[PDB]
Amino acid sequence: AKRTKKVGIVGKYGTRYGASLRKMVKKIEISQHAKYTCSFCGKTKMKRRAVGIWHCGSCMKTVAGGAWTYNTTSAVTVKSAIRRLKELKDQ
Amino acid sequence: PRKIEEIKDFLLTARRKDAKSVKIKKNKDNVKFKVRCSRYLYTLVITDKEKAEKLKQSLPPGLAVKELK
Amino acid sequence: CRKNTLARRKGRHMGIGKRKGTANARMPEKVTWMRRMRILRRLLRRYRESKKIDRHMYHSLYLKVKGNVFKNKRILMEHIHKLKADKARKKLLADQAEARRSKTKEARKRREERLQAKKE
Amino acid sequence: VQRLTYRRRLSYNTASNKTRLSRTPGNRIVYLYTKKVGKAPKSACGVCPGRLRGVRAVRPKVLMRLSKTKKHVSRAYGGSMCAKCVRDRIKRAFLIEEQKIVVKVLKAQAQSQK
Amino acid sequence: PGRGAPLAKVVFRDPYRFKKRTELFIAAEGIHTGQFVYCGKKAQLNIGNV
RNA sequence: GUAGUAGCAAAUAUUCAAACGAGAACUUUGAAGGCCGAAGUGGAGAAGGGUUCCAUGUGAACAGCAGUUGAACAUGGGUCAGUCGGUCCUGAGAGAUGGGCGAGCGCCGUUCCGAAGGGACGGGCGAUGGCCUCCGUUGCCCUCGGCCGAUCGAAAGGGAGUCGGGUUCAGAUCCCCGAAUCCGGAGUGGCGGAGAUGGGCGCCGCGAGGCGUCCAGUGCGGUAACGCGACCGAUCCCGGAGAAGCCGGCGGGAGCCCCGGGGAGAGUUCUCUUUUCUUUGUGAAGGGCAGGGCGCCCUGGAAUGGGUUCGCCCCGAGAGAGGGGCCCGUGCCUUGGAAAGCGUCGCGGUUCCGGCGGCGUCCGGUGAGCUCUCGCUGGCCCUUGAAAAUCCGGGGGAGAGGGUGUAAAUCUCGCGCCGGGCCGUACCCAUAUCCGCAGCAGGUCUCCAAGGUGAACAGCCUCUGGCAUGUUGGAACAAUGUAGGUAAGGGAAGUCGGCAAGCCGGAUCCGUAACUUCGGGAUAAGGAUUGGCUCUAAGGGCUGGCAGCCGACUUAGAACUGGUGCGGACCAGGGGAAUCCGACUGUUUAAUUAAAACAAAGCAUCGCGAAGGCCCGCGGCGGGUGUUGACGCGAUGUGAUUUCUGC
RNA sequence: CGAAGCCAGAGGAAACUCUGGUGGAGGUCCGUAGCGGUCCUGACGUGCAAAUCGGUCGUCCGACCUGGGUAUAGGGGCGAA
Ligand SMILES: [Mg+2]
Ligand SMILES: [Mg+2]
Ligand SMILES: [Mg+2]
Ligand SMILES: [Mg+2]
Ligand SMILES: [Mg+2]
Ligand SMILES: [Mg+2]
Ligand SMILES: [Mg+2]
Ligand SMILES: [Mg+2]
Ligand SMILES: [Mg+2]
Ligand SMILES: [Mg+2]
Ligand SMILES: [Mg+2]
Ligand SMILES: [Mg+2]
Ligand SMILES: [Mg+2]
Ligand SMILES: [Mg+2]
Ligand SMILES: [Mg+2]
Ligand SMILES: [Mg+2]
Ligand SMILES: [Mg+2]
Ligand SMILES: [Mg+2]
Ligand SMILES: [Mg+2]
Ligand SMILES: [Mg+2]
Ligand SMILES: [Mg+2]
Ligand SMILES: [Mg+2]
Ligand SMILES: [Mg+2]
Ligand SMILES: [Mg+2]
Ligand SMILES: [Mg+2]
Ligand SMILES: [Mg+2]
Ligand SMILES: [Mg+2]
Ligand SMILES: [Mg+2]
Ligand SMILES: [Mg+2]
Ligand SMILES: [Mg+2]
Ligand SMILES: [Mg+2]
Ligand SMILES: [Mg+2]
Ligand SMILES: [Mg+2]
Ligand SMILES: [Mg+2]
Ligand SMILES: [Mg+2]
Ligand SMILES: [Mg+2]
Ligand SMILES: [Mg+2]
Ligand SMILES: [Mg+2]
Ligand SMILES: [Mg+2]
Ligand SMILES: [Mg+2]
Ligand SMILES: [Mg+2]
Ligand SMILES: [Mg+2]
Ligand SMILES: [Mg+2]
Ligand SMILES: [Mg+2]
Ligand SMILES: [Mg+2]
Ligand SMILES: [Mg+2]
Ligand SMILES: [Mg+2]
Ligand SMILES: [Mg+2]
Ligand SMILES: [Mg+2]
Ligand SMILES: [Mg+2]
Ligand SMILES: [Mg+2]
Ligand SMILES: [Mg+2]
Ligand SMILES: [Mg+2]
Ligand SMILES: [Mg+2]
Ligand SMILES: [Mg+2]
Ligand SMILES: [Mg+2]
Ligand SMILES: [Mg+2]
Ligand SMILES: [Zn+2]
């Protein structure tokens, strides 16, 4: 049921720590706790270890990704550039 | 300790040297023979008094016999 | 002690004026949810372990035990006797139509077989 | 009810002093010292956490006593690989070595007609 | 610990002695366990290849 | 002088009789009345104390009264090991040579500016001695040997392996008896059993057979998971174990509790009570089987998707199902094991006597019960939660061995033999063995923990186990006091201030605003019930060809009853309306203050790309930050949030 | 007290909402052991004591509490000041 109608996951800190702080942690407590869809084992057991490490349950293949999310805006863009500077006519 | 399952196996164990004592303990339904040889206590549990006495007469004479209490 | 405790299991000494903790502390909610849902979730097996209720109604009724629908074993036992009648009513009315499907499939086959025999 | 007392002089609840208790033949409840768990050897590559099968599982200093069947498995890569990685190191060492030969005779043909 | 970055641990082969060497790179983004990091002068330009 | 004065007042307590004794409010025994009440006034230790332990003897000291007593004095006793521990190992660190510095004792420094391995097996030659067959000892020679630097550092970390019973005035896993094991060592190499004797041919023999020839033998079984009593192998290489946080749930096992029955002894019997209490066992080690765990294998492929947890999760990267394998077994039975132990009944023996004897040491049930252990499984972390001595396995193949009716290189298999040095070991471990000047209501690190009430290890009262009111007793019942309790009527009028007291409390059913960062407030406020007994209603478990036996303690309902009494003692939130300060949790002025003071997350500002920022330094380009690199270090102001940041 | 996930019923065309459950996150809340020491401006004040005792209190899964080991020493150490 819609128990807490605005805060969602940040019903654990409760009364305190300021309004706009909890608004700005809610977006990023969700992101590190979700079960991301693994690109290798096909399953959704992507779970992070300690910060910057991501880990899938089946096939047990450990990938360094973002610090809170799995990817980064930097991560896709540098992957975009590095293939593009690779296929630039022999390196 | 260890347990024996053939009377031949225990009789050969009685022939084994580095052994000094055999304890015949008359329990009610069965009777056990116990060699105190070395590092072990070899027990053979047998059901008959007649098998007991003819095992007693098969006992090696250098090995001491003591019937318990 | 035993004399006075024999009175308690009768239901004496256990009103409102001798309880001093919460009823959630005396026999907790989760422990009552464990027991009742181990009562139920093994009866639903022993039905499908024989021919009683099919594989498909089980997992439909399994999750419906996992939700708050059935209060105890009794109304679950009444509810399955409700269900296996309605499977019987669907299958009783279906098979007479399906046999009546069969008589007209085969009569149009027998109009096929006899007329074409006269066509040669 | 017979409240029971340590047999050694380690009165602190330490890691090594981690016990069970048994019942003597004098009807006295004694406090008997438990050897710790011998956790089994797990396998190489670390693809799976989970111990290797068929190995009697004791302390490393115990292992001088056991026989050389209660420490490994009859297979090649006996007590070290998890028996799924053995039958993957077979398939991987075969299928790559075929590709050595194919590329060597493909590039022999690159040195042939070119 | 004491670093917020993750920390890679790359295996090799010593070209002079029959021995495998275990060295510790810094885990750049996107690498996963089981990658063939190829390092040297004429390394082909991908992620992780120094 | 003060003066026979203050004083011997913290934590409920003594009583009667009897013995020894010059001599008894205290010593001893016995009975009653008691309290500590399992977070103990109990059972044992680490630290420290060092003879305090035990026994006997005296009563001048000392024990704040006394003493016939002692932790006093005097005399004499007691502290036993391969498996209990120190030793060994590394952790934070502490520390010599090389080197640097220094007037200098020396400091810096720990791999730094270094010829920092003295070992190896094998080849070789040379010598040597035994039984010069062959071995055994060195000389030097070809080959490897990151020597990643010595060495110290834990009586709580790492660390192979001991149990059960008895014994003393005093010790015990240490002595005795009985039963186990680990680690080393074994020339002429102790004894089996494996590697071990298979096949082809011929010659003859009815065969049994033998003879010769030649070849092969570094083991076997299962499709697999892996299995067995053994299973050639160096330098070197790979890995595992040692080797990991914290908190939840839950399941398995054990201890203790609890229910019924037997049996043994005792408790009451005024009346009842098939009653009430005590007691009712199997060690290490070896083997068998329960039970649990698996992300182990095979068959085979499911959508109408199913399988399952309290919660998930699970799967075409192969589910349910059918059938195996491994690992754990602290559970039960078995060898030990009933000959001991224990209960109770007898009988000797002046005695020593681990006397002798008869009997019993059983049947079950139940669980969110508590503790402990093993395991599953998940949550949290800008928190990812130790090294090493040692030990094992695997991959490789340097060589090594036997030549046949010859048995060798071998061996983690089953036994046999020998040893295991050195130090520590009594006691108190505390309202009387420590420290606080002392037998000081303080201080000091843990393990074990029953019955009743009850949510509970709260508090209250009992058992086992302890004690004797805490450095005194007798008489009386003034003032003052310190604690403690009530008070007609009024209810802050008292005082600087409701200070202190006193209300309210536990529970179920009711009912809940202003205000808000939508989380709250909030157990708001305000209410109603509560006992006793006599019942009903509902919640289950194991077998079946829709029944029958047996099980846990809760939840609602109703009657009747008491003098409207019922959380009947203990146990236990007064409440609102608001103003100022601080976001909160945290911390601080040990001994005059806990605050608004400090910190705090948030917001900013600044330095610095390393021949550098900030710092230490008596010294060297010695050091810390730095096992670092602008999402970082170093330096400050401000102090949650929201809205604002003028000149 | 009941954060996320989660089931089940109900309404909707979508977006999803509404209701009963399950779940057990926190520098949570009432509290014990432990650790602190607000108040009575109480006892005590040639005391039990060169800072105690009794009531009443604060926090009590957390920046916790504590034993042993090691480091830093006098214009020096250390400090949530
Ligand atoms: Mg709940
Ligand atoms: Mg006087
Ligand atoms: Mg006076
Ligand atoms: Mg007398
Ligand atoms: Mg006298
Ligand atoms: Mg009391
Ligand atoms: Mg005590
Ligand atoms: Mg004494
Ligand atoms: Mg005397
Ligand atoms: Mg005196
Ligand atoms: Mg003396
Ligand atoms: Mg001994
Ligand atoms: Mg020098
Ligand atoms: Mg130095
Ligand atoms: Mg050392
Ligand atoms: Mg230790
Ligand atoms: Mg040991
Ligand atoms: Mg003793
Ligand atoms: Mg003994
Ligand atoms: Mg040996
Ligand atoms: Mg259990
Ligand atoms: Mg055993
Ligand atoms: Mg039970
Ligand atoms: Mg002692
Ligand atoms: Mg004291
Ligand atoms: Mg004290
Ligand atoms: Mg305890
Ligand atoms: Mg208790
Ligand atoms: Mg109760
Ligand atoms: Mg007395
Ligand atoms: Mg007295
Ligand atoms: Mg005293
Ligand atoms: Mg006193
Ligand atoms: Mg009055
Ligand atoms: Mg009045
Ligand atoms: Mg009034
Ligand atoms: Mg007024
Ligand atoms: Mg005034
Ligand atoms: Mg007050
Ligand atoms: Mg009153
Ligand atoms: Mg309020
Ligand atoms: Mg104002
Ligand atoms: Mg504050
Ligand atoms: Mg103060
Ligand atoms: Mg601000
Ligand atoms: Mg510098
Ligand atoms: Mg603006
Ligand atoms: Mg709080
Ligand atoms: Mg509150
Ligand atoms: Mg609190
Ligand atoms: Mg309170
Ligand atoms: Mg105080
Ligand atoms: Mg005062
Ligand atoms: Mg005074
Ligand atoms: Mg307190
Ligand atoms: Mg000075
Ligand atoms: Mg501080
Ligand atoms: Zn994956």
DSSP D76-108: SSTTTS-SSSHHHHHHHHHHHHHHHHHHHHHHH
Task: Provide the edge-to-edge strand list for the sheet that holds A62-63.
Answer: A46-48, A54-56, A62-63
Vertex B26 angle, CA B22 and B31, to 5° = 75
E window 11-50, beta carbon within 8 A of A = 27-34, 44-47
- Report, in angstroms and rounded to the nearest whole number, the Rg of chain D calculated over CA atoms: 27
Q: At what angle do helices C73-119 and C29-49 cross, to 10 degrees?
A: 30
β-strand pairing of B21-26 with B64-67: parallel
- Classify E21 as helix, strand or coil: coil
**Helical H segments across chain B, by residue range:** 7-15, 49-56
Query: Contact D85/D43 with Cβ under 8 angstroms?
Result: yes
CA dist., res. D33 & res. D7, Å (int): 9
Q: Would you call C74 helix, strand, or coil by DSSP?
A: helix
Per-residue DSSP letters for D15-62?
Answer: SS-----EE-TTS-EE--PPPPP-PPPB-TT-SS-SBPTT-----TTG
Instruction: Provide the β-strand partners of residue B2.
Output: B42
Across all strands, nucleotide nearest A13 (CA–C1'): G26
d(CA D35, CA D62): 11
C-beta separation of C76 from C67 below 8 A: no
Name the structure determination technique.
cryo-EM
Burial of residue C42, with CB atoms counted within 10 A of its CB: 0-12 exposed, 13-18 middle, 19 or more buried: exposed
- CA B66 – CA B53 distance, rounded (Å): 14
The response to whether A59 counts as a known ligand-binding position is yes
Task: Give start and end residues of each alpha helix (H) in C22-119.
Answer: 23-26, 29-49, 55-66, 73-119
- CA distances (Å), origin D68, targets D58, D60, D62: 14, 14, 13
| A88: contact with E, CB 8 A cutoff | no
Residue that the structure tokens 């863009």 belong to: A77
Q: DSSP secondary-structure letter at C50?
A: T
Q: How many beta carbons lie within 10 A of that of residue B44, not counting itself? A: 20
Q: How many C-beta atoms surround the C-beta of residue B47 within 10 A?
A: 9
Q: List protein-proximal bases of chain G (any atom < 7 A from a CB).
A: 1-9, 17-28
Secondary structure element (H or E) that encloses residue E11, with its range: strand E10-11
- A69 touches A51 (CB < 8 A): no
Q: Is A80 marked within a binding site?
A: no
The beta strand positions in chain B, using DSSP E, are: 2-3, 21-26, 31-36, 42-46, 64-67
- Asked if D35 and D16 count as a contact pair (C-beta separation under 8 A), the reply is no
Beta carbons of B43 and B1 less than 8 angstroms apart = yes
Distance between CA atoms of E29 and E26, rounded to whole angstroms?
Answer: 9
Nearest nt (C1') from C55 Cα: F306
Strand G neighbours (CB under 7 Å) are: A 1-5, 7-14, 16-17, 33; C 24, 29-30, 33, 63-64, 66-69
Report the candidate in B58, B64, B62 with the shortest Cα–Cα distance to residue B35. B64
Q: Whats the size of chain D, residue-wise? A: 114
Q: How many alpha carbons fall within 13 Å on the CB side of residue B31?
A: 16
Nearest to C48 by CA among C40, C37, C56: C56
What single-letter DSSP state applies at residue A70?
Answer: S
User: What are the angstrom distances between the C-alpha of B43 and each of B7, B17, B52?
Assistant: 11, 16, 13
Gap between the Cα atoms of A65 and E27, Å rounded: 9
DSSP character at residue A14? T
Q: Tell me, what DSSP letter sits at residue A36?
A: B
CA nearest B4: which of B56, B41, B47?
B41
Q: Which chain D residue has its CA at the smallest distance from A58's CA?
A: D48
Resolution (A): 3.9
Residues in contact with C6: Cβ distance below 8 Å, sequence separation at least 6, in sequence order: none
Q: Determine if residue A56 is labeled as part of a ligand binding site.
A: yes
Residue C28 in contact with residue C47, Cβ under 8 Å?
Answer: no
Q: Of A58, A35, A30, A59, which is closest to residue A48 (Cα–Cα)?
A: A35
Q: What is the residue-wise DSSP string for D44-56? A: TT-SS-SBPTT--
Strand partners, E26: E7
Residue B57: which of B29, B27, B24 has the closest Cα? Answer: B24
DSSP symbol at B47: -
User: What are the beta bridge partners of residue A63?
Assistant: A54, E32
Q: Give me ligand 39 centre to Cα C75, in Å.
A: 58
The long-range contacts involving C82-85, CB below 8 angstroms and separated by at least 24 positions, are C83/C53, C83/C57, C84/C52, C84/C53
Residues 6+ apart with CB under 8 A from E21: E11, E12, E13, E14
